[PDB]
Amino acid sequence: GLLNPRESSKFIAENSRDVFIDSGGVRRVAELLLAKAAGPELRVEGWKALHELNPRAADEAAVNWVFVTDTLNFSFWSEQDEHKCVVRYRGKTYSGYWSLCAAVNRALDEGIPITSASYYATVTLDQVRNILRSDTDVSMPLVEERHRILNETGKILLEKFGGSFLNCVRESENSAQKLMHLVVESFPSYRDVTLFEGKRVSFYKRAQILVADTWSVLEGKGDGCFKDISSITMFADYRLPQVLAHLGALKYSDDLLKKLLKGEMLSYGDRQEVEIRGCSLWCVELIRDCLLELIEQKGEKPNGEINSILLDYYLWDYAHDHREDMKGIPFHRIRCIYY
């Protein structure tokens, strides 16, 4: 049945009708990343050093914070930029994914144990609305799905994993692939799989970002030392394709650009949606290959291994920091629990 995310993406990219990978753009992005390759933006330390809302500690508490944020890491876009969820934390203002992290830190600082499965297994919809409350008139999208997924995930964590995601990490035996599979097999909300040309393809956006963020919060050490961390792909969402299209690595058909410019909502597993996701994922694989070849050619000996995770982290931050520049090619619009 099931191709892994890397194999899925190659198959999708090779059979794509409406999304194209531009070799010139792949080269362009690789040359941009090469100039930043010595910076904190392309090292595991950047996950903490560049994002104040991320846990400082490499402890069980921090591992469970990553579990809860990645369990809810989906669908933060609003229809207009003037009209969106904002969460204030320690006198700073956050939107999109960061508004979720702000809301989690706000709850923990209030003494609400929102990162404990003993709490979120049975948290009510009322409680979740309060915890995720916006400081604007506009709510976070899909709060009912976030409530249901917290209950589902906390029940499984208590029953199968002693109420801590650190038990799942330890059972993975320093394998990123084993941790990815344990998560997808154990937690239904992580089953990010669909059809393409009658084959079962996988993306595992939330399961792979959970492994990457586990690696990051544990600083690639101890329980978070993953011998096969380079095997994790980019996290196929709506912001990464938008920044690859902006930088010229992805090209869209007229039918697809038409939908994007009008804000026509795509559905999970639509051919065009699967082509955007598969082409983005394969596109980062090619950028990473090109970057490593550029680094080999300059006779460089990087002080750390560059991988698809670190390219994703960089490009997602780039999307966040250059949102104004990217108006002309919108992100694709979808409401689903997978991303």
Swiss-Prot record:
Active site: 237
Protein name: Queuosine 5'-phosphate N-glycosylase/hydrolase
Lineage of source species: Eukaryota, Metazoa, Chordata, Craniata, Vertebrata
Binding positions (queuine): 51, 235, 237, 312-313, 317
UniProt-recorded Gene Ontology molecular function terms: hydrolase activity
Other comment: Eukaryotes lack the canonical genes for de novo biosynthesis of queuosine (Q), present in most bacteria. Therefore, this molecule must be sourced from ingested food and/or the gut microbiota, and metabolized to its corresponding nucleobase, queuine (q), before incorporation into cytoplasmic and mitochondrial tRNAs. Incorporation of q into the anticodon of some tRNAs contributes to translational efficiency and accuracy.
Keywords noted in UniProt: Acetylation, Hydrolase
A GO BP annotation: nucleoside salvage
Purpose: Catalyzes the hydrolysis of queuosine 5'-phosphate, releasing the nucleobase queuine (q). Is required for salvage of queuine from exogenous queuosine (Q) that is imported and then converted to queuosine 5'-phosphate intracellularly. In vitro, can also catalyze the release of the q base directly from Q as substrate; however, it was shown that Q is not the biologically relevant substrate. Shows a very low activity on queuosine 3',5'-diphosphate, and cannot release q from queuosine 3'-phosphate and from the 5'-nucleotides AMP, UMP, CMP or GMP, indicating specificity for the queuine base.
Keyword flag Cell inner membrane: no
PANTHER family: QUEUOSINE 5'-PHOSPHATE N-GLYCOSYLASE_HYDROLASE (PTHR21314:SF0), QUEUOSINE 5'-PHOSPHATE N-GLYCOSYLASE_HYDROLASE-RELATED (PTHR21314)
Native source organism of the sequence: Homo sapiens (Human)
Keyword Acetylation: yes
InterPro entries in the record: Q_salvage
Reactions catalysed, as given in the entry: queuosine 5'-phosphate + H2O = queuine + D-ribose 5-phosphate
